[PDB]
Every structure is written in C-alpha cells, then in structure tokens.
C-alpha cells in the first residue's frame, strides 16, 4: 500500500481535468493500512510513519532503482531502529489475493457513494 | 418519647466529640472552619475550635463552658476533656 | 483496679463500674491512633507492661503531666455528662 | 501417617519450590533488576507484574490474622540482605527461612499459574471494543 | 446530509475491523439466542453473527463474503480499504465536488493500479 | 481535546462570515442592531468592530485587524 | 453551616489540585506555552509565566487557597521554580488518597515524608559540585 | 541580546553550589529511595516508595510540550541511572557515568552540564522543602465547616 | 470506545474481591444459593465459580482456566484467578496514559519467559548429588 503511493501520485498530474482530485485521494486512502499496524502496536505515529515514506522514497543519482524497496511495516514489540527488511522473514502476498481484493473493494465503496437516498419501512 | 428528645442530643454531642477526637495531640488532624464573615482560621487547639464553631445546639454548648473552665483552672486538657465527656455518653 | 473492685458492689451500680473503666481507655487509644501506630496493638501493650512495673519510658523522654489536669478532667467530665442527661426536654422560652 | 502423606505427593513429581512467599518474593525482586536492563516501555510494565505477585502473600496473612502491611516491609528487609530465601511462618508472625522448616510447594502449580494468569489477563486487554449479542 | 451520517454508521464498525487485522487481532465472543457461543477471529464469519440495522451496512458485508468464497483470504483487506474510501470521499463532499466524478475517478485509478501489479 | 476544537471554531466562525467581504465584487452585509439602524457597508473593518464575541480567540483576531 | 467528613473530603482535595495542576502542566519549563485568563468583565491577558497565573487564579477551596500562598512564597524569594512546586504537591495528594483503601494512617504518611526529606538532602549534598571541566571541555559556552 | 544571555550566566555563577537540572534530581533520587526505604520500614516504607515515584511526573509533563513521548524518556532514563549507582559506592567505574539529563531540543539524552542547563542548589532545596509543607496541611484536614 | 475495556476490568474485580478471602485453608468461605434453594458451603474455588453464572463474556475466561487447573493439577484454582485479576488492576491506569495493549502484553510475556528459567534455577532438584532416592524424602 505504501509503494503504490508514489506511482499513483505520478499519474495524477499526468491526467488533466477534474479527475486529479479523486486520484490524489485514492493514494492517500492506502495510508490506513500502515497506520493501523503502527497504532495498534503501540508505536508512535511521529516516528514509524515518517520513516515509511522515506523508505520507498529516496534520492538515487541514477535512473535504475537501488538500495532496498522491500522495507515494510514492522510490529516491533521489543525494540528496533527504523524499519527492517521483509525479505528476511519471507512474508509475501499472492497476486491473485491482492488483485481480487482491489476490484471488490472498489465496487463496495462505489455503491455507497452512489446512493443519495434510502427508503425504509418498519416490520 | 421524652427520652428520645435527649437521645437526639446525645447523638449530636458524640458527633462533636468525634470531630475533636481527631485533633488530640500534636500529631492530630487539624480542622478547617470558614466563618460567615469570611475569616479562614485553622489550628489543633480544641478551645479555639469550639469557640468559633458557633454551635447552635443547646446541649452541645456545654462543652464550651467546660473547655473554658479547663483552661482557666488546669490550663491543659481542653481536647481530652471533650473525648472523656463523649465516652460516658456513648456508654 | 476498678474492674476488679466492681465485684465488691451490688445491684445496678455495680455494672456502671465496669462501663466506667472502659470509658477511660479512649484517651490512650486516641493517642495511639493519631500517632500512626496500630490502635488495638498499642493498647494491648499498655496492660501488659503496667502489670509488673509501676509508672515506668516517658520519664526518659521528659514527658510530665501534672496531676491536677488528670484530676480536673475527670471532675469536670462528671459534671458535664450529668448536666446533659438531666435535661429531659427543651422548649422555646422568651 | 502424616509423614507418609506429605512425601506421597512428592513421589509423583520431584520438582518442588519453597512456599510461603519465599519463591514469590525472589521472583518479584529479580524482575525489577532485569527490567532495568531493558529499554523502552517494557521496563515499567515488568515492574507492574512484580507488584502483582504480592497479592498472594497478602491474602494469606490477612486470612490468618497477620498484618499484611507490617509483614511486607519486614520480609523485604531480610530479603535484600544476606539470605534471600527467608519465608513467612504460618503459625506465629516472625521472619524465618522456610528452607529450615522444610516447607515445600509443588512447582507445577506455579508454572501453570503464571502461564494461565498472564495469558488470560492479556486476552481481555487485547480487544479495544467488544460487541456481544444477548439472548 | 444522511450521506455523511451513513459513513459515521460504518465508522462505528470501522474501528471494529481495525482491531482485527494485524497480530493484535482478537476473537469476539457472541452469545446466540439459542444458547450457543461462537468464537472466531475471522471478521467475515462475525458478520453473519451480528444483527445489521442499517441496510447500507449489508453492502459491505456482501462484498466481504465474496472474498471468503473465492480466494478465501484477504477479507480484512477488503472491509478496511472500503471503509477508508468513504472517509477520503467525505472531504470531497464538503469541498463541493459531486459524487459522480468521484465514482469516475476511481474507475480510472483502478485500471492504472491493475496494470502496475 | 475539546479546548483545541473550541479554539479553532472560534476564529473560523468569524472568518467564514467575512468571506464575502473580499474583492471588488464583495457582497454587502446586514447586521441587526438593537436600534432601528443597520450597517449597510461591506467593509470588514467596520463590521468586525460591531460584532459581539464570546470566546477570547475571536477577541485576539479583532486586535489583529486593527493593527493590519 | 454544613459540615462534611469521611472519604468525601479526601476526594475533593484530589479533584481540587487536579484542575490546578492542569494549569501549570503545560507551563512547565521554557518549552511551555502562554495561556489566557478570562474574567466576568471580558478582559484577558497573554503571558507565558505560570507564577503570574496563580496570582490571579480564582479557586474556592480550603486546600486550593493553600497553594496560592505557596506560590507567592517562592516568588518573593527565589522567583523561579514555582511551576514545579505545584506539580510535585499535586501528585503527592493523589498517591496519598490511594493509600486509604490500604488502611494507611495519614500521620505515618506525613512522618514518612519528614524522615525521607531530611535524608534526601544529605544524598543531594553528595552529588553537588562546583564549576568544573574548565580545561579540556566547555560548560558556560553552551549556555549562551 | 548579550546582556540577556549574560543574565542567565551571572545568576548561575552567583551561587558556588550548583546542581544539574532537567530531571537529574528527581530521577537519581527515585532509585536511591527504593533500596533506602528498606532501612526504615515499620509501615513507613510504603510512604517512601510513593514519595519517590511521585517525582517522575516532572520529566513526564516536561516532555509533553516538546512533542516527545513521555513514557519512553522517563523509562529509558531510569535504565541509565540504574547501573550508575551500582558501582558508585565501590569507588570504581568503567562505562558508568552520573548526571544523565534530558535534552528536548535535539531529542537525545546528554549530560545537562555540557548541554548548558544549570540551576543553583538553594533554588532546589527550598522548592522541595516548601512543597511538602503545603502537602501536610492538606492531608491533616478531615472536616470542612462552612457557614 | 475505551469504556468497553474499563467495563471488562471492573468485571474481574467484583469476582476477585469475593475470592480474595478464600485464599488459604483457614480463609473465608463463599455461600451461594442456587435457584433450587439448595445452600452449599465449600472452599473450592472451582465450585464457587460454576455457581455464579456470570453473563459477562470475558469473565468466563477465569472460570474456564479454573476448571483446567483443578482437573490436570488440582491445586491453585483460587490463586490463578486472584493473580490474573491483580495483574489486571495494575494495567488499569496504563490505559488512561494512551499506552496500547500490544506493548503491555509483550511486557508481561517477557517477565514470564524470564520466570520459567528462574523457577528452574530456584527449584533444587538433586538425585545422585549429596542425596539419594531415600534421604531426599
């Protein structure tokens, strides 16, 4: 969810028109996943959250990416400095599960926003 | 119920003795009393507490006359005489 | 001493000597409570030590109470409690 | 007959610990020192668990008539100085070592107690909002 | 402004799912009227054991069951993500942006995300 | 946290009303005085001085307009 | 007049010093922030000093007025550290009220503080030192 | 600005007896009173433990305005002072140092002597002594009488 | 909100306060009268919890662990509930400070992990060293 922030905001300014408002808010909505894991784990928002943005966004003098793009959200529970590599614990997510969850979650919020009126009756 | 009228005065007298009981000795508990005029005074002396307490109860005012004679005759024990008085009332 | 001498009396007055001895133990009990010490624990230590010894230590601590204070405290309390129980009613008088 | 019934339960399991607050006091003191070497919020949390272990000797002294306030300060005095195995006498209140009186307690009780009590307490606090239906 | 209050009704159940995903998650004890206690950590199973009042809540429940039937995994990812899309859209309602272009914006952003997977 | 919300809503309630006082197209405003008169001008400096405020954060915003 | 006693007056002393401590809670240290005092007239003031706030602080309570004279005692002599004194005295009242359920006598609580106060001064005097580190290091430099 | 900076310097150097501030007085005394409370006892040990733990509120609330976490700073500060008093009476030390302070500007733990925060001893002694004088008069009131 | 956790803490306190005097062979006993009007008096901590029938869902956890303590072991049925409840009281003020329950759980599990190795060190088990199968008993 954090890595998709840099790619979606890049396409926001590329598409002209009023669609820029929905594209920017679409990438910000992915910040709830790292914030939920950091808040429930007792970690400070002013500490872990700014380190997550700097993990996937760095200044590299070159066109080819380098360093480590695999740094995720760490639960901690004992102690740590910054974040750690996810490839050490080999925690991955299948594409079939992630891709299917996007289309379902998109149509779920679409139905709620499309309904401006609700009619009910007592039984 | 001629005695129940007196029993109501005995219970009210034991409440005053229990309040002064906590102030006995140098380590006793002080009492805060705010006068109607706005003066705020505090001390552990039992004679000064009952003097500014302005007790409206007729029987409870007898402890003030005893405390006045306690300081005028012996000079000490104004707090202990209130506790000893309430002990006989409880028995 | 008054607890043992209470058997020498007879009738209703004999029971008063038993309650009068317990009414005198409130003064030493309050002194133990206001000092932070355990209430009942210090009172039990008083009856234990005063049996063998007599007035023995506050003398080393320089604590001396004159006898007239302890005498007037009982005398004034006897007249104060008497003036209370003798009032059987009160009414507005002016 | 009384001597056989005591060693009977000790034959099934030979792993025993010193009872009467002995073992409970030694654990509470060591966890305070081990927490001092652990940085972070876990330092004050471990110290809270050591204080929670004092409720076991408390109720034992209160139900027997002893004063839990005085026995707690008198035991800790001799606990941190010299011999750390000093326990609490069940009959007469006084300081003493349960190792001399040969008073033992099975260790399997404390092992399952510390595991069950800590887990059951952590499960209740693990949820922020509980929604339970009625019927 | 019921469209704003409709998000608040889901927000009450949003914090329930925020305590599910992650190692801090915990099962919820539910006592049925028949005298049977069902205890499970899965949030999709809990939705069947909860009484739904507002009919708009059932929309997210029906979408959550789709994740369990087909792929069987990611039920917490669907409900939490769908609840956050309503919070970011609430600011656009107060801003004056119509909900029609908001729906069209998600369709363009969804096709761009699938190509990057 | 309720005190931080009251501090924001105190200064914003004054700012949201004067939003129509900006620019040459600024719309006129009408205040209701106890006297039969009224303030027909759209000048923000004259309107803010006649508005009675309660929360002290709005009082600090009035002193800033006098210096500006 | 009315007369109260028991555990009700002990709970009022904690609630009285709680609102007073919250006034000096955010003003502690140089990192503190200013606050405003609004009276019935409608005027106010802006200051970052917690000592001047306690002088104009209006609180009706027997224990609350004690801290008023305590704040003026430190200002007329030292003039600094008044904010830290109120915070210390506020926590001592909250922890002492919790000992009521433990059947702890208040005089023992007071006696325990007087014995610890005299022994704490001796421990503080052991770590006191004059100006040092003049050669090889710098001390007064980082102050300015 | 030089006269204002000199004012802080001349007031500190006026008293030859100074003490490092920033929480060094309250934190170092908290651990010392833990083992010292056993030497007294007799129902007074519980009052000393609550008196020592009541001093941790000063560094706690101080870190609130600095946006730093008050739970981590107070906890980690006790860990450093723990090993500082272990080798102190032995008159020998290697990695153990005293006077650990709290710097909220840079967000790190450094000595307040080198950091530039110094306070006189007279100010600290009279502040702690007068704080307990008002606490005694409050706890001794069991009754409130108002006409 | 946070009121659900506070309601769960006070649920275990009301059950603990009844079981506090029951610790020890000389401790107090709890009397429970079932709707059948059958009065039973016993010092067993497991029998007392079975007759309470607490509606609070999280309070049944202390009853479930008490039945397993009396079955697989048989000793410590009352002490496991008091220890679990007293540990809950120490964590009550930690909620108002904003500390999440994640680090609270990891802090206690760290002490228990160090306690298992501590109990084995404190417990003295000897067989062929300065003892035998007889002199030991």
H35/D contact by beta carbon, under 8 A: yes
Task: Tell me the chain B residues in contact with residue H141 when contact means C-beta distances shorter than 8 Å.
Answer: 29-32, 42
Which of I91, I98, I103 should be substituted to probe chain A, the one whose Cβ sees the most A Cβ atoms within 10 Å?
Answer: I103
The β-bridge relationship of strands D16-18 and D86-88 is unpaired
CA distance, residue G106 to nearest chain B CA (Å): 9
- Return phi, psi of residue I30, to 5°: -100, 135
Distance from CA of H52 to the nearest CA of D (A): 15
CB contact under 8 A, D39 and H45: no
Closest CA of chain D from I42, distance in Å = 16
Chains touching G (3+ CB pairs < 8 Å): B, C, D, F, H
In angstroms, the CA I3 to CA I21 distance is: 29
**Cβ separation of D31 and I28 shorter than 8 Å?**
no
| Cβ–Cβ under 8 Å, residues I116 and D108 | no
Whether E117 sits inside 8 A of A95 (CB atoms) is yes
- Distance CA(G99)–CA(D104), nearest Å, equals 34
CA distance B25 to chain H (A): 13
Contact flag B91-C19 (C-beta cutoff 8 Å): yes
Within 23-62 of E, beta carbons closer than 8 Å to I belong to 23-24, 29, 31, 37
The string of DSSP letters for E46-109 reads HHHHS---STTHHHHHHHHHHHHHTT-S-HHHHHHHHHHHHHHHHHHHHHT--HHHHHHHHHHH
Distance CA C1, CA C8 (A): 12
With beta carbons under 8 A apart, name residues in chain E contacting D135. Answer: 31-34
Site of tokens 């507005």? C92
Contacts of D among chains (3+ CB pairs under 8 A)? A, E, G, H, I
Instruction: Verify whether the Cβ–Cβ distance E31 to I57 is below 8 Å.
Output: yes
Resolution in A: 4.6
Q: Report the DSSP pairing between strands H143-146 and B31-34.
A: parallel
The 8-class DSSP code of residue G35 comes to B
Q: Are H9 and G108 in contact (CB under 8 A)?
A: no
Secondary structure (DSSP) of A36-59: HHHHHTT--HHHHHHHHHHHH---
Taking each helix axis from N to C terminus, what angle separates A95-114 and E2-18, rounded to the nearest 10 degrees? Answer: 150
CB atoms D44 and H75 under 8 Å: yes
Question: Half-sphere exposure (CA, 13 Å, Cβ side) for B13?
Answer: 27
Q: Taking CA atoms, what residue in A is nearest to I98?
A: A42
D45 reaches A (C-beta below 8 A):
no
Q: Are 3 or more Cβ–Cβ pairs between H and D shorter than 8 Å?
A: yes
Q: Report the residue of B12, B20, B30, B32 to disrupt the G interface, i.e. the one with the largest count of G CBs within 10 Å.
A: B32
Cα separation, C26 vs I52, in Å, equals 44
Q: Going by C-beta distance under 8 Å and a sequence separation of 6 or more, which residues neighbour residue E30?
A: D131, D132, D133, E37, E38, E39, E46, E49, E50
What span, in angstroms and rounded, lies between the C-alpha atoms of H104 and H22? 9
CB atoms within 10 A of CB G23: 17
Interface B-H, measured as beta-carbon pairs within 8 A, has a size of 28
User: What's the CA gap between D34 and D46, in Å, rounded?
Assistant: 9
Q: What's the CA gap between A55 and A85, in Å, rounded?
A: 10
Q: Which residues of F touch G36 (CB under 8 A)?
A: 56
Give the CA distances from residue G22 to residues B11, C8, G46, G90, in Å, rounded to whole numbers and listed in that order.
42, 68, 17, 10
Sign of CA dihedral I75, I80, I81, I82: positive
Q: Which chains touch I (3 or more CB pairs under 8 A)?
A: A, D, E
For residue I108, the distance in angstroms to the closest alpha carbon of chain A comes to 12
Contact H63, H102 (CB under 8 A): yes
Helix (H, G, I), strand (E, B) or coil at G129: strand
Taking alpha carbons only, the member of G13, G98, G110, G22 closest to residue G64 is G13
C-alpha count within 13 angstroms, C-beta hemisphere, residue H20: 22
Chain B hits for G107, Cβ within 8 Å = 27
G107 touches chain C (CB under 8 A): yes
E-assigned strands of H37-85?
none
Chain D residues touching chain G at CB-CB below 8 Å: 69
Question: CA B62 to CA B56: how far, in whole Å?
Answer: 11
Q: Kindly give, in sequence order, each residue whose CB lies less than 8 Å from that of residue E69, ignoring residues fewer than 6 positions away.
A: none
Cβ-defined contact of A79 to D41 (cutoff 8 Å): no
The reply to whether D100 touches chain I by the CB within 8 Å rule is: no
**Is G108 in contact with C36 (Cβ distance < 8 A)?**
yes
- Which residues of chain D lie closer than 8 angstroms to G102, CB-CB? 69
Give contacts of G107 with chain C, Cβ < 8 Å: 34-36
Determine which helix (DSSP H) or strand (DSSP E) holds A95, and give its type and residue range. helix A95-114
The bridge status of strand H18-20 relative to strand G2-5 is unpaired
Task: Give the tokens for residue E50.
Answer: 């909860």
C67 at B interface, C-beta within 8 A: no
- Mark yes or no for CB contact I106/A78 under 8 Å: yes
3-state class (DSSP) for residue A71? strand
């Amino acid at each position: 969810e954090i890595e998709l922030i840099s790619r979606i905001t890049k396409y926001g300014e590329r598409t002209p028109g009023l669609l820029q408002l929905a594209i920017k808010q679409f990438a910000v909505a992915f910040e709830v996943v790292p914030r939920t894991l950091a808040e429930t784990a007792g970690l400070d928002v002013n500490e872990v959250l700014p380190n997550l943005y700097a993990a996937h966004n760095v200044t590299e003098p070159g066109a080819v990416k380098t360093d480590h793009l695999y740094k995720g959200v760490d639960i901690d529970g004992e102690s740590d400095e910054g974040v750690k590599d996810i490839r050490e614990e080999n925690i991955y997510d299948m594409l079939a599960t992630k891709k299917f969850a996007i289309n379902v979650a998109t149509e779920a919020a679409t139905t709620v926003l499309s309904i401006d009126q609700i009619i009910m009756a007592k039984k | 119920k001629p005695q129940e009228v007196r029993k109501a005065n005995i219970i009210a007298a034991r409440s005053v003795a229990d309040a002064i009981r906590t102030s006995l000795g140098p380590k006793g508990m002080d009492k805060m009393i705010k006068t109607s005029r706005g003066e705020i005074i505090i001390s552990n002396d039992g004679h000064t507490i009952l003097k500014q307490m302005a007790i409206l109860h007729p029987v409870a005012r007898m402890l003030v006359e005893v405390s006045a004679a306690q300081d005028s005759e012996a000079g000490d024990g104004t707090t202990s005489v209130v506790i000893l008085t309430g002990a006989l009332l409880g028995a | 001493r008054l607890s043992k001498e209470a058997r020498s009396m007879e009738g209703v007055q004999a029971f008063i000597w038993q309650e009068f001895a317990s009414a005198l133990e409130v003064i030493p009990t309050t002194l133990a409570e206001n000092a932070g010490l355990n209430s009942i624990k210090v009172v039990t230590e008083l009856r234990s030590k005063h049996e063998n010894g007599e007035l023995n230590n506050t003398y080393e601590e320089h604590i001396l109470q004159p006898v007239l204070v302890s005498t007037s405290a009982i005398t004034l309390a006897s007249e104060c409690v008497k003036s209370i129980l003798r009032i059987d009613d009160i009414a507005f008088s002016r | 007959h009384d001597a056989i019934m005591i060693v009977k339960r000790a034959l099934q399991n030979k792993l025993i610990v010193a009872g009467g607050g002995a073992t409970e006091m030694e654990v509470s003191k060591c966890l305070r020192d081990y927490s001092k070497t652990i940085a972070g919020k876990q330092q004050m949390i471990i110290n809270a668990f050591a204080k929670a272990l004092e409720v076991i000797p408390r109720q034992l002294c209160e139900n027997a008539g002893f004063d839990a306030i005085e026995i707690l300060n008198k035991l800790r005095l001799a606990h941190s100085k010299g011999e750390k195995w000093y326990g609490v006498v069940f009959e007469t209140e006084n300081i003493g070592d349960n190792f001399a009186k040969f008073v033992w307690e099975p260790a399997l009780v404390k092992i399952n107690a510390l595991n069950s009590a800590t887990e059951a307490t952590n499960l209740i606090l693990s949820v922020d909002e509980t929604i339970t239906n009625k019927g | 402004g019921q469209i704003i209050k409709s998000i608040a009704a889901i927000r009450e159940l949003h914090q329930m799912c925020l305590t599910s995903m992650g190692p801090c998650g915990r099962n919820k004890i539910i006592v049925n009227h028949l005298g049977k206690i069902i205890i499970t950590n899965d949030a999709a199973t809990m939705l069947r054991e909860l009484d739904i009042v507002h009919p708009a809540v059932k929309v997210l429940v029906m979408a959550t069951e789709q994740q369990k039937i087909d792929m069987g995994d990611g039920t917490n990812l669907v409900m939490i993500l769908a609840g956050e899309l309503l919070n970011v859209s609430e600011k656009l309602i107060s801003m004056g942006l119509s909900a029609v272009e908001i729906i069209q914006g998600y369709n363009m952003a969804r096709k761009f995300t699938l190509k990057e997977l | 946290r309720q005190a931080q919300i009251s501090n924001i809503t105190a200064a914003k309630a004054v700012a949201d009303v004067i939003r129509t006082c900006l620019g040459p197209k600024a719309m006129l405003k009408m205040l209701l005085d106890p006297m039969g008169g009224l303030v027909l001008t759209n000048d923000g400096h004259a309107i803010l001085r006649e508005i009675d405020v309660a929360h002290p954060a709005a009082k600090s915003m009035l002193e800033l307009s006098r210096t500006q | 007049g009315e007369k109260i006693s028991g555990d009700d007056i002990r709970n009022q002393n904690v609630l009285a010093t709680m609102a007073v401590a919250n006034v000096v809670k955010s003003s502690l240290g140089p990192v503190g922030l200013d606050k405003m005092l609004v009276d019935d007239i409608g005027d106010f003031t802006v200051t970052n000093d917690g000592a001047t706030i306690l002088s104009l602080l209006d609180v009706q309570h027997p224990a609350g007025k004690i801290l008023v004279e305590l704040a003026q005692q430190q200002d007329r002599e030292i003039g600094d550290g008044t904010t830290s004194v109120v915070i210390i005295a506020s926590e001592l009242l909250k922890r002492a009220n919790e000992l009521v359920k433990n059947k702890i006598h208040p005089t023992t609580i007071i006696t325990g503080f007087r014995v610890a106060l005299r022994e704490a001064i001796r421990f503080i005097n052991e770590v006191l030192s004059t100006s040092v580190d003049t050669l090889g290091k710098e001390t007064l430099i980082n102050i300015a | 600005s030089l006269h204002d900076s000199l004012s802080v310097v001349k007031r500190t150097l006026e008293s030859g007896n100074v003490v490092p501030g920033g929480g060094c007085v309250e934190a170092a005394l908290n651990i010392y009173l833990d083992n010292f409370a056993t030497t007294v006892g007799s129902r007074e040990q519980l009052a000393i433990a609550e008196f020592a733990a009541a001093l941790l509120i000063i560094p706690k609330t101080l870190a609130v305005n600095a946006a730093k976490d008050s739970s981590e700073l107070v906890a980690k500060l006790r860990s450093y002072h723990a090993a500082s008093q272990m080798a102190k009476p032995e008159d020998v030390k290697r990695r153990s140092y005293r006077n650990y302070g709290l710097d909220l500007i840079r967000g790190k733990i450094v000595d307040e002597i080198h950091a530039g925060v110094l306070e006189p001893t007279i100010s600290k002694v009279k502040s702690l002594k007068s704080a307990l004088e008002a606490c005694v008069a409050i706890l001794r009131i069991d009754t409130m009488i108002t006409v | 909100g946070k009121g659900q956790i506070i309601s769960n803490i006070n649920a275990c306190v009301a059950v603990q306060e009844a079981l506090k005097p029951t610790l020890g062979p000389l401790g107090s006993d709890i009397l429970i009268v079932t709707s059948n009007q059958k009065t039973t008096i016993s010092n067993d901590g497991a029998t007392i919890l079975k007759l309470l029938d607490v509606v609070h869902p999280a309070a049944k956890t202390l009853v479930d662990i008490s039945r397993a303590q009396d079955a697989e072991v048989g000793d410590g049925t009352t002490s496991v509930t008091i220890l679990a409840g007293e540990l809950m009281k120490e964590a009550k003020p930690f909620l108002e400070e904003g500390i999440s329950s994640h680090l609270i759980m990891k802090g206690y599990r760290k002490a228990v992990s160090l306690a298992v190795e501590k109990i084995n060190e404190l417990a003295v088990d000897i067989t062929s060293e300065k003892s035998s199968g007889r002199e030991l008993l």
